[PDB]
Design a protein around this nucleic acid. Structure first.
Ligand SMILES: [Mg+2]
Ligand SMILES: [Mg+2]
Ligand SMILES: [Mg+2]
Ligand SMILES: [Mg+2]
Ligand SMILES: [Mg+2]
Ligand SMILES: [Mg+2]
Ligand SMILES: [Mg+2]
Ligand SMILES: [Mg+2]
Ligand SMILES: [Mg+2]
Ligand SMILES: [Mg+2]
Ligand SMILES: [Mg+2]
Ligand SMILES: [Mg+2]
Ligand SMILES: [Mg+2]
Ligand SMILES: [Mg+2]
Ligand SMILES: [Mg+2]
Ligand SMILES: [Mg+2]
Ligand SMILES: [Mg+2]
Ligand SMILES: [Mg+2]
Ligand SMILES: [Mg+2]
Ligand SMILES: [Mg+2]
Lengths: 234, 150, 138
RNA sequence: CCUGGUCCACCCGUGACGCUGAGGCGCGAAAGCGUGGGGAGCAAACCGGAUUAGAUACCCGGGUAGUCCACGCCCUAAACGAUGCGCGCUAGGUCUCUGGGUCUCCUGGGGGCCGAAGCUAACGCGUUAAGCGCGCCGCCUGGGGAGUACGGCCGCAAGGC
RNA sequence: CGUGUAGGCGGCCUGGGGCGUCCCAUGUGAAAGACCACGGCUCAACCGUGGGGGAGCGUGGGAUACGCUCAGGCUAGACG
């Protein structure tokens, strides 16, 4: 099932902008592009899942992050569709390493959330209404997915590890397992659990995220059909 | 909670139209005395606050000092930039011979019998930093041949 | 033109490990082999084998590093932390059996040629001999 | 016309014949010196005109050595990459010069930029190392006194070591 | 900045010597001092007894990996 799916349109990516470390994970250079050895992707998808699963069936939460447009929305779905915190906008800094503080801006979102449905708005001049509204707007804007667990995720899954290296660093300094889907434009070594393959064409990102979140809920019960993906998918 | 001894505190300063603002520094060590220690450097607008922050980072970053008889496993040398430190293990009943920096750090780490020499730059700060990486890199017959398995 | 091939080899290795490479071919030599043998017989490598790069005989020498690590810079520790030649082509170093060094307090080794085979610190000290201190490894 | 170094290709010849290098020898920008040519432009010195408190300067109009050639001296320099030479080893990205090939590619020498690892006091370096090693030479050991003094050697001198 | 004299440094394998290098034995390395023990002066300082050491160097024997030397072969340096 996998072989044909992935190889269908979910392998081979970045070209001549590589990073030699990631060579063990490459077959050749067709028409310029670096086409990765999928066969090795499996033996690596395996162990990775072998880790996802050994966590799924022990109820430990995973922070997903994707801040790139080509892979944004598709992480807002698979995350809601597995009840896992995520970061879809600008992955602010020190979210993890400075947790006891960023959490002060989540406790600031629900500060407004509950003064939203209330008799206090009868007052509060228009200067505090456009304000307290907007403040909630953006508050909600970046913290749509970063609330769920008020606790450090026992892991983090992510698209382009070098794209969101900042985050990777935070986790790395906090002894947090790091899972992610890195192309050639990414250095293996500093990734605990590695998903080698495309990282831009929305194809491989939905095919790997899906079965990622599909292996999530296969240790909780609720085996369903795939989640929203096609609406303008090419 | 561990021991927590204070190495040195200094008043630095910067410039700005009107006069010179300030800041104080705190280099601090910490250790139960079982083989656990941590070095921490703390800067803050006031003496006490700085000394506080000291211990906080101190505990944050700590190391497993593999003692032995109350001394140390092997002899090592480490350079931290311009400052170099020599740690050489002594027989029971010798003393902890070192400067205030390396001694302090070495006491709470446990050691009672150690020969030390402070070469290179003797920048208090940097000597400390150096002393740690020394310990950090300490091995026992165990974790030695534990790597020569195969 | 390589002044001292041995000190070369050692360095070849020293440079290899620094980035954790699989094997490295130092040009072949009975004495180098002899030395290499003691890196394997004592376990600083998986070992070595004879090879060829156009009628030209090097030695494939497979390194040996530690376990991957938690935290940042996950790079493993190394079996060969520190290797450096003692006796040199411009300052030959010899030792009676009583003078023989005690590397890294028993934890390390000091390879060294002799009239009865390339021994090591323990190996010579016990065999009851001395000879040209060749290098120190740990 | 005469002549040096140098890269590539073919794997043909020699069979370690190598690396370095105290002293020695050769070369060594400009200015400078000797003898003899040459002399348009430029231009120390020098002369005026301005500016200026003054203006032995800056700017302006003049202008001599010199700048050029031959032969012979002089031997300095921010003579700079302020980085001695040779060899091995340690990611790559990019553009550029110039060789060779069953030439969208590959490989060899060279000139650059960003950069692994690593070094670094920092700035920065980074297969054109300031990384990792070996060989051999040169050199440093607080500032001023002083590259002065004395002696010595060299030079016509100026002066050099 | 080159060139190169002496000198320092020397690629792969085989054999001979065994010069450096390595080991053993033996002579030597006075005594005093020093260091370890034991006692004499009431302790000590001083002082006596015994023991254990000392590189070096001479002599006899042994070893031959690395350096050297003589002998043989090779082509990865270097030259053509
Ligand atoms: Mg240093
Ligand atoms: Mg022939
Ligand atoms: Mg030369
Ligand atoms: Mg000249
Ligand atoms: Mg001239
Ligand atoms: Mg003239
Ligand atoms: Mg004029
Ligand atoms: Mg004129
Ligand atoms: Mg220049
Ligand atoms: Mg030179
Ligand atoms: Mg080039
Ligand atoms: Mg650069
Ligand atoms: Mg390069
Ligand atoms: Mg003085
Ligand atoms: Mg001077
Ligand atoms: Mg002068
Ligand atoms: Mg004179
Ligand atoms: Mg010569
Ligand atoms: Mg002999
Ligand atoms: Mg005596």
């Amino acid at each position: 099932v996998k072989e044909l799916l992935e190889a269908g349109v979910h392998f081979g990516h970045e070209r001549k902008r590589w990073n030699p470390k990631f060579a063990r994970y490459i077959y050749a250079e067709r028409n310029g592009i670096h086409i990765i050895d999928l066969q090795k992707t499996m033996e690596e998808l395996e162990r990775t899942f072998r880790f996802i699963e050994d966590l799924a069936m022990r109820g430990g939460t995973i922070l997903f992050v994707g801040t790139k447009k080509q892979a944004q929305d598709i992480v807002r779905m698979e995350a809601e569709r597995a009840g896992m915190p995520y970061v879809n906008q600008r992955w602010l800094g020190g979210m993890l390493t400075n947790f006891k503080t960023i959490s002060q801006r989540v406790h600031r979102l629900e500060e407004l959330e509950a003064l939203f449905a209330s008799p206090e708005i009868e007052e509060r001049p228009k200067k505090e209404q456009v304000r307290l509204k907007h403040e909630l707007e953006r508050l909600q804007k970046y913290l749509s997915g970063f609330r769920l667990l008020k606790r450090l995720p026992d892991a983090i899954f992510v698209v382009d590890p070098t794209k969101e290296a900042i985050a990777v660093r935070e986790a790395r300094k906090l002894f947090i397992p790091v899972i992610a889907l890195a192309d050639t434009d990414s250095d293996p070594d500093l990734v605990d659990y590695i998903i080698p393959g495309n990282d831009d064409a929305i194809r491989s990102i939905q095919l790997i995220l899906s079965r990622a979140v599909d292996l999530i809920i296969q240790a909780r019960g609720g085996v369903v059909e795939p989640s929203p993906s096609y609406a303008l998918v090419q | 909670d561990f021991e927590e001894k204070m190495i040195l505190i200094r008043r630095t300063a910067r410039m700005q139209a009107g006069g010179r603002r300030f800041r104080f520094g705190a280099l601090v060590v910490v250790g139960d005395r079982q083989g656990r220690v941590g070095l921490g450097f703390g800067k803050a607008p006031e003496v006490p606050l700085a000394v506080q922050k000291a211990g906080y980072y101190a505990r944050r970053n700590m190391v497993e000092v593999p003692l032995q008889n109350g001394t140390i496993p092997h002899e090592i040398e480490v350079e931290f930039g311009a400052s170099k430190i020599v740690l050489k293990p002594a027989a029971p009943g010798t003393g902890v011979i070192a400067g205030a920096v390396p001694r302090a750090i070495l006491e709470l780490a446990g050691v009672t019998d150690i020969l030390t020499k402070e070469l290179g730059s003797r920048n208090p700060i940097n000597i400390a930093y150096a002393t740690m990486e020394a310990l950090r890199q300490l091995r026992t017959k165990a974790d030695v041949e534990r790597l020569r398995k195969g | 033109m390589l002044t001292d091939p041995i000190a070369d080899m050692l360095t070849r290795i020293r440079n290899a490990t620094r980035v954790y490479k699989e094997s490295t071919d130092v040009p072949a030599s009975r004495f180098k082999e002899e030395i290499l043998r003691i890196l394997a017989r004592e376990g600083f490598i998986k070992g070595y084998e004879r090879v060829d790069v156009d009628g030209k005989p090097y030695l494939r020498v497979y390194l040996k590093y530690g376990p991957r690590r938690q935290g940042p810079d996950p790079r493993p520790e190394q079996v060969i932390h520190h290797i450096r030649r003692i006796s040199k082509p411009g300052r030959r170093v010899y030792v009676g059996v009583k003078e023989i060094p005690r590397v890294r307090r028993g934890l390390g080794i000091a390879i060294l040629s002799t009239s009865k085979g390339v021994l090591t610190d323990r190996e010579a000290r016990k065999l009851g001999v001395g000879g040209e201190l060749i290098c120190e490894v740990w």
